[PDB]
Structures are given as C-alpha cells and as structure tokens.
Ligand SMILES: OC[C@H]1O[C@H](Oc2c[nH]c3ccc(Br)c(Cl)c23)[C@@H](O)[C@@H](O)[C@@H]1O
Ligand SMILES: OC[C@H]1O[C@H](Oc2c[nH]c3ccc(Br)c(Cl)c23)[C@@H](O)[C@@H](O)[C@@H]1O
Ligand SMILES: OC[C@H]1O[C@H](Oc2c[nH]c3ccc(Br)c(Cl)c23)[C@@H](O)[C@@H](O)[C@@H]1O
Ligand SMILES: OC[C@H]1O[C@H](Oc2c[nH]c3ccc(Br)c(Cl)c23)[C@@H](O)[C@@H](O)[C@@H]1O
Ligand SMILES: [Ca+2]
Ligand SMILES: [Ca+2]
Ligand SMILES: [Ca+2]
Ligand SMILES: [Ca+2]
Ligand SMILES: [K+]
Ligand SMILES: [K+]
Ligand SMILES: [Mn+2]
Ligand SMILES: [Mn+2]
C-alpha cells in the first residue's frame with residue numbers, strides 16, 4: 055500500500071467514516087479519516103485557492119482555502135513527516151466523484167521543496183499543455199483546450215460524471231528529507247473550480263505526497279478520493 | 287518604545303533577567319525574557335547557520351541553529367505576529383558586547399517575505415560591500431574588506447571590544463500583514479562567526495523584526511542585545 | 519542631471535524629437551531619443567504586459583510588450599550598462615500626460631536583480647496598498663482603492679488629466695554592478711492599463727533605472743516621460 | 751540522432767575538428783564544431799563556476815566561466831533556440847576522457863526555466879545523494895561519498911581514467927517553448943573541479959539541452975564530449 059499524506063478539500067460529508075456533517079478541509083496522515091478538519095464554506099462556481107506548508111523544524115502541516123472576497127478556512131496538525139513519509143516522494147493532486155458529482159478543475163499548481171544539510175525543487179503551472187510531459191496523469195485525469203487540468207471525467211459541454219477518479223503527479227521524484235539535513239520544508243498552492251448541477255456535490259480534490267511508485271488503489275473511488283484502498 | 291520580535295543567539299547567561307544558565311537560542315516577543323529557549327552548544331571559532339521561519343496559518347515561529355558536522359538546536363513558539371507587530375516592519379540583525387566580548391560577524395543573510403491577498407520581497411547577501419546602500423547600519427555595525435558585516439567593534443587587529451552595539455536593517459520596509467490577507471509568511475537565513483578571547487563570550491546576535499523607525503534604544507547594551515530599553 | 523536607462527512605452531509620436539511616426543516601444547540610454555524602437559500596436563482599454571531583461575555577459579537589453587490574444591512586439595539594444603549606470607541604482611516606473619492624455623495604470627510589477635561575485639533582490643507587487651511604504655511616489659503617482667498604482671492624475675470619476683507626471687521607485691537601492699562581479703542580471707515585468715478619451719492618447723509609461731537620488735526633472739512633462747530635463 | 755545544444759568547457763584542443771589550439775569555452779549548436787569560442791584560462795585543481803543564460807526575446811545564448819580571484823572568460827552566440835530545439839527537452843551535464851584524462855567533478859548544479867504565454871521549473875543541487883532519483887545517470891556517471899557528481903570514471907584514491915563518458919539529466923522533461931508563449935528563458939549554473947596528473951588534461955565538461963529521449967551516442971567518446979555521433 056502507498057504511504058499517503060494529503061490535504062483534502064472534501065465536498066461530500068461521509069459521516070460513517072469520520073467526516074463532519076459539512077464540506078470540510080482536512081489533513082490526512084495515512085488514512086482518509088482526517089487527523090484534523092475545519093468547516094469549508096464551499097462556493098460551487100467560484101475559483102478557490104489552497105495554500106499548504108510545512109517545515110521540519112516547526113513540524114506543523116497547515117492549509118488554508120479561500121475565494122476572492124470571502125472568509126478563508128484554515129486547518130493544521132502537528133506531525134513530523136520524516137517519521138511518516140520516505141525520503142523520496144512524488145507530489146500530486148487527486149480528485150474523485152462517486153454517486154454524486156462535480157467538476158474537479160485545477161487552473162494552477164505550484165510547489166516548492168527545500169532541503170538544507172541548500173537543495174531545492176520548484177515548479178509552477180498556470181497553463182497545462184495538451185501533452186504535459188512533466189506530469190504523470192493517472193486514471194481519468196486529462197488536460198483541456200483551455201489549458202486546465204481536469205482530474206475527473208467531464209463533457210466538453212461542461213457536464214461532470216460519477217464513479218470518476220484521476221490524479222496528476224509531478225514527473226520528478228522529490229527529496230523531502232535526509233539524515234544530514236537541518237531543515238526540510240515544502241509549500242504548495244493550487245487554484246480550483248468546482249461546478250455542479252447537483253444540490254449536493256461530491257467528492258473533492260486533494261494535494262498529496264506519497265511513495266514515488268504511488269498508483270490509484272482499486273476501490274479508492276468516491277469518498278476515498280483516489281488515495282486509499284480502504285477507510286481505515 | 288519600539289515593538290520587537292527577535293530570535294536571539296544568546297552566548298552569555300544573564301540568570302538575573304531570566305536567561306537559563308547556559309548559552310541558548312531564544313524567541314523574544316516584546317521582551318528580552320525569551321518566551322521559549324533551547325540550549326545552544328556554541329562552537330566559538332566555527333561558522334554557524336540560523337534558519338528562521340513563520341507563517342500566519344501555522345502561527346508558529348521557529349528557528350534552528352547548526353554547525354557543519356555537529357548536531358543542531360531548535361526552538362519554537364506559537365504566536366500570532368499579526369497581533370504583535372505593525373503591518374509594516376523593518377528586518378535586521380543586532381549584536382552586542384558588554385563587560386565580556388566576542389566578534390559578531392555575519393557572513394551571509396537572506397530573507398523572504400510573502401503576502402497573499404501574491405506580494406513578495408526577497409533579498410540575499412553573500413558578500414557585503416564596503417558601502418551597503420541597501421542596509422541601514424546602526425551603532426558600531428560596519429562591513430569589512432573581507433565582505434563581511436561586523437555588528438560589533440573589532441580592532442584593526444581583529445580583536446573584539448566590549449560595550450559595543452550594532453545593527454543592520456534592510457533599507458526597504460516589509461509588508462508582513464494586511465487585512466485582506468489570506469497568508470503571510472517569512473523565512474530568514476544568516477551565517478555567523480563568533481570568536482572570543484574570553485572564557486565566557488558575550489553577548490550574542492539576533493535576527494529581529496520591528497517598527498520601521500526602530501533604532502538602538504539607549505542602554506540596550508550587553509545583555510539586552512541592542513533591542514530593548516530595559517529587561518522587563 | 520540624473521543618469522537614466524529606460525524602456526519606454528510611448529503612446530504618442532513626437533516626430534520633432536526623434537520618435538517614429540507611430541506608437542512604439544523604445545530603449546532609452548541617457549536620452550529620450552530612443553537607441554532602438556519598434557512599432558507598438560496599442561490596444562487602449564486592454565491589459566498589457568511588459569517583460570524586460572538584461573545581463574552583463576550577453577550585454578543585450580531587451581523588452582517585449584504583449585496583450586492577451588494579439589501578437590507581441592519586441593525591441594533590443596546591445597549595451598554595457600556597467601559603462602552607463604552607476605554601481606548603485608533605483609528602479610522605477612514613470613508616466614506622463616501633456617496636451618493629450620490617458621490613464622497610466624499599473625496593475626502589477628516585479629523585479630529581480632542578481633550580482634554574482636550570489637547577491638540578489640526580488641520584489642513583486644500584484645496589489646498596491648493604500649500606503650506603499652516600500653515605494654517612493656514622486657509627482658502625481660498614487661495608489662487607489664482597487665489596489666492599482668496610478669502614475670498620472672485621474673479624477674474621482676476615473677477620467678485622466680493632461681500635464682501630469684508621476685513615478686514610483688522601489689524604496690531600496692539596487693546593486694547592479696561591482697568590480698569583482700562575474701555577472702549581473704536583472705528582469706522586470708509589469709502589467710498596465712491605458713484608457714484614453716483622446717483620439718491620440720499620450721504620452722506613455724516607462725520602466726527606468728537611475729542614480730539612487732533620481733527625481734522628476736522639471737519640464738520632464740509630456741513627451742519626455744518624467745525622465746529627461748530636455749529632448750537632447 | 752539527438753538534437754543538441756551545449757556549452758562546452760573544452761580542456762583538450764582537437765585542432766583537426768575546429769577547436770582553437772587552446773583550452774576554450776564554446777557554444778555548440780547541433781555539432782561539436784562550436785559556433786563560437788573563447789580562450790579558457792584553465793586552472794586544474796581549482797573550483798570553477800559556469801553560468802549560462804538565454805531568453806527568446808534577446809536570442810543570445812551566453813556563458814561565463816570563472817574561478818575565485820581570476821579573470822573570467824565569456825562567450826555568446828546569437829541564435830533562436832525555438833528553431834533548433836523541440837518544445838520539450840531534458841537538460842543535463844556531460845563529460846568525457848579519451849587518451850588524455852582528468853576528473854570531471856560537478857560540485858553543484860542549478861537550472862531555471864520560465865515560459866510566459868508564467869510556467870517555471872527550477873532545481874538546485876549543492877549535494878548529490880548516493881541515489882539521486884531525480885537524475886538520469888548515463889554512462890559512467892555516478893555520485894560519490896562527498897555528495898559530488900563524478901561524470902567520468904575515477905578511483906577513490908583520486909586517479910581519473912581514459913575512454914570514459916558519463917552524463918546526468920534532470921529527471922523531469924522541461925518545456926522550453928510553446929506557440930502561445932511571449933518569452934522563454936533559462937539560466938543554469940554549475941561549479942566543477944578538474945584535477946589531472948597529465949600535463950595536458952582532457953577532454954571536458956558540458957551543459958547541454960536535448961530531445962527528451964537523449965542518450966549517449968556510440969563513438970561520442972573523448973573529443974565529442976558524450977554529445978555527438980560524429981564530428982560534422
Ligand atoms: O459521491 C458521493 C458518494 O456516493 C456513493 O455513496 C452514496 C451516497 N449516497 C448514496 C445512496 C445510495 C448508495 Br448505494 C450509495 Cl453508495 C450512496 C459512494 O460512491 C461514496 O463513496 C461517495 O462518497
Ligand atoms: O558582557 C556580559 C555581561 O557583562 C556585563 O555585566 C556583567 C557580567 N559579569 C559581570 C561582573 C561584574 C560586573 Br560590574 C558586571 Cl556589570 C558584570 C554587562 O555589560 C551585561 O549586560 C552583559 O551581559
Ligand atoms: O501629450 C502629447 C503632447 O502634447 C503637447 O504638445 C503637443 C501635441 N500636439 C500639440 C498641438 C499644439 C500644441 Br501648442 C502642443 Cl504643445 C501640442 C506636449 O505636452 C508634448 O510634450 C506632448 O508629447
Ligand atoms: O583525450 C584526448 C584525445 O585522445 C584521443 O586522441 C588522441 C590524442 N593524442 C593522440 C595520439 C595518438 C592517438 Br591513436 C590518438 Cl587517438 C590521440 C581521442 O580519444 C580524442 O577524441 C581525444 O580528444
Ligand atoms: Ca467525504
Ligand atoms: Ca544573555
Ligand atoms: Ca513620444
Ligand atoms: Ca576538444
Ligand atoms: K487521516
Ligand atoms: K557547433
Ligand atoms: Mn473528509
Ligand atoms: Mn537570553
């Protein structure tokens with residue numbers, strides 16, 4: 055099984071497996087049952103931004119989601135990712151639908167990693183090309199004619215579909231820790247557009263970090279957000 | 287009085303005003319009496335590195351000090367700087383000597399600030415020029431023919447003197463918060479060389495953030511590290 | 519007099535002092551009489567982008583102007599800025615109106631300098647605050663409640679006025695060369711909105727580099743773009 | 751055959767295939783016969799630095815090599831790499847020995863690419879790990895116990911070998927151009943240590959950019975620097 059760390063923008067409350075009964079942002083450490091969550095005041099049809107950060111000295115993974123003009127929502131969890139993740143990871147975005155549905159559109163994605171022992175990786179996309187050779191598209195993930203990343207299946211009409219799962223990983227492995235290292239830190243930002251006709255959209259989007267050979271686990275659809283085999 | 291946030295590398299224990307009884311790294315919020323400290327295994331004569339980071343979501347100010355070879359020391363404190371600091375600041379280094387003394391040599395200094403409402407400021411110095419027009423030098427601070435910044439008095443011969451105070455501020459004010467801000471972060475690194483003829487070197491170095499019109503408070507000498515008017 | 523290097527977006531042809539007979543992008547070295555120009559297909563009412571770059575090895579200063587959609591214009595000039603500019607500079611934007619007029623609105627501005635002997639300065643503004651303490655505003659320059667920088671007078675109603683000059687300099691001086699330097703580079707981007715009620719808008723916008731104590735030369739109005747004391 | 755653009759630090763004069771009769775730096779466009787060169791004042795046993803830059807507006811690929819304290823050497827060539835290279839490339843370093851020999855030690859390597867239509871890639875290594883998962887090592891290339899990259903074969907004693915070729919490519923494809931794009935630019939820096947017992951060291955080191963599936967061509971040893979099948 056993959057080792058997974060994620061920040062979930064969770065649109066659909068699955069109260070039977072630990073979600074609060076509201077759209078929430080959460081921090082997931084090796085389980086879909088977030089270690090910490092916060093009410094997300096969703097706005098179907100607006101562009102949202104997530105920013106995510108961690109460093110190995112503070113040991114505090116935190117995330118904020120916002121929309122232009124709105125109040126933002128934040129969540130944090132104290133954790134030493136050196137004891138959770140392996141030294142080398144791939145970083146990526148995931149998204150699912152299930153019985154309910156939404157567009158999982160990513161308009162932009164940037165990521166920075168630093169390791170001082172200074173080694174660094176940084177990448178930033180404001181367009182996605184039709185053939186993103188520096189992305190590993192998994193599942194139903196694809197790029198569109200506006201240079202956006204659609205993680206889950208959609209018509210060119212506009213209409214999203216159910217039982218869809220797609221991810222996008224940065225092609226290059228990332229070195230997030232080492233024995234020598236004094237500090238390791240990463241920061242990630244993405245902007246996203248969730249539209250739905252459904253009164254109750256589902257399921258959500260994820261930024262995540264995993265072992266390098268990470269793949270969509272089977273039965274990780276809908277509420278497991280493409281990350282987890284089961285809901286332990 | 288100035289408003290001060292600082293990370294202090296305090297080479298000299300002043301137990302009568304709250305220092306632990308050993309050299310330590312501290313986080314100072316509006317007082318010399320550090321809110322959080324950790325033991326610092328000084329290595330007079332060797333080049334040390336300090337990394338400092340904060341962001342407004344995690345609300346944790348952290349610092350780590352390290353020498354090439356040995357293990358390193360960290361210190362953290364949970365604080366919302368938006369309730370401590372004005373919206374515009376200057377950032378700087380300070381150092382002092384009192385009755386006991388040491389060189390307070392800065393070999394390099396970098397700083398990055400970000401404000402997402404993205405606005406940003408990054409500066410990096412590896413070589414300090416003979417006339418650093420982008421620094422405000424206060425007190426005894428000067429740059430030397432090696433391209434280092436000496437915060438405290440050092441003779442023609444290279445011997446440190448007591449009763450010295452100096453500071454260097456980046457010339458441009460930094461926007462560290464604003465109302466409509468989603469997240470504010472900053473990171474700082476400097477490297478430093480402390481040499482002493484005294485069996486107990488003193489008094490230390492700080493990275494500090496302050497009101498833009500900050501100046502050396504009179505009687506901030508020695509154990510108050512060029513930051514504070516008294517020891518309250 | 520000041521020493522000026524500038525990239526001019528010159529909306530108004532002043533053929534009597536060397537402008538070509540159309541709107542143009544120019545590179546100005548110590549004179550309003552551009553050393554190199556190219557035709558600029560203005561689109562009053564649309565958001566334009568300018569990118570400028572130089573480095574001391576290639577010795578080529580280049581600029582490109584672009585609107586989303588249409589094709590773009592470029593201009594270059596081979597010059598060793600180390601023989602033109604002092605070692606320390608300020609960097610800024612200027613704009614003017616004369617008898618004819620336009621809005622000279624800056625929506626964003628970024629600048630990166632590097633000096634390898636690495637020393638560097640990066641600043642980026644997407645939103646200009648109501649009180650930009652890291653800018654020196656000269657002349658009619660001001661920031662507005664949209665978070666834009668208006669270089670020239672614009673009424674309560676949003677109508678531009680003639681006989682306006684304004685400039686904005688980054689507060690910190692920039693080290694663009696030193697003896698022991700291997701390479702010096704700089705890059706600048708700004709975005710801009712020019713609206714005009716006049717059939718011939720005027721006079722234009724510049725990005726400029728100058729002596730640190732640069733100020734608006736009297737009679738630099740209109741066609742001299744807030745940079746030059748005369749048209750020599 | 752690969753499409754190759756390179757900057758060669760050429761230690762061994764092969765006058766029969768277009769080299770000047772001296773150690774030189776050159777710019778190679780689809781042939782080992784540099785389009786432009788300049789005398790390199792080699793210093794076997796000192797750390798050298800190369801910096802390389804290009805942008806699509808200026809159309810000037812330039813490189814500078816230097817050592818601490820020395821005079822630097824520079825070379826440039828005007829070229830539009832959009833008409834030479836494909837949209838997607840891998841970037842890398844190469845090195846050979848032949849009958850004569852030298853260490854081809856890389857101590858550091860950084861690279862930045864930007865594409866404005868802003869998309870960007872940046873990576874920086876000051877150590878190389880024992881298993882660099884974000885590098886594609888080709889030929890004899892390997893990382894060592896000091897976290898340096900040895901492009902060509904060496905004893906742990908110190909002693910280099912002949913008939914050696916190795917390269918190192920960044921794992922992620924890089925997008926250096928697109929139809930939409932206004933500007934594309936890249937910058938690269940590496941530091942290097944060439945030691946030799948030979949009175950006449952050979953052959954040299956390269957930074958290069960190629961089609962993504964680039965591989966060491968057979969018979970590209972010694973003077974062809976791992977890049978080219980023949981000396982056309
Ligand atoms: O997309 C929303 C949800 O739809 C599915 O489950 C249900 C939500 N309401 C239901 C009603 C009936 C049945 Br059967 C099912 Cl599986 C569900 C599953 O795909 C869930 O994992 C998913 O979170
Ligand atoms: O430089 C180290 C310290 O030396 C001075 O105080 C003393 C340290 N040991 C002493 C012994 C005697 C006397 Br009097 C004094 Cl003031 C001190 C003062 O300058 C202190 O502020 C400073 O921290
Ligand atoms: O704003 C455009 C131009 O208007 C002014 O000059 C003239 C442009 N057309 C004219 C017609 C008549 C007279 Br008088 C004048 Cl000064 C001008 C002057 O302010 C020029 O410097 C400026 O470039
Ligand atoms: O490493 C230096 C050079 O050594 C080889 O060629 C010769 C240099 N001097 C010689 C003398 C004899 C013979 Br045979 C050869 Cl191939 C050479 C070849 O491997 C060249 O490609 C290479 O540049
Ligand atoms: Ca859910
Ligand atoms: Ca003390
Ligand atoms: Ca004009
Ligand atoms: Ca050769
Ligand atoms: K969890
Ligand atoms: K060539
Ligand atoms: Mn959830
Ligand atoms: Mn203390």
Ligand SMILES: [Mn+2]
Pocket residue numbers: 526528537538542544550552
């Ligand atoms: Mn002109």
Ligand SMILES: [Mn+2]
Pocket residue numbers: 758760768769770774776782784
């Ligand atoms: Mn050659």
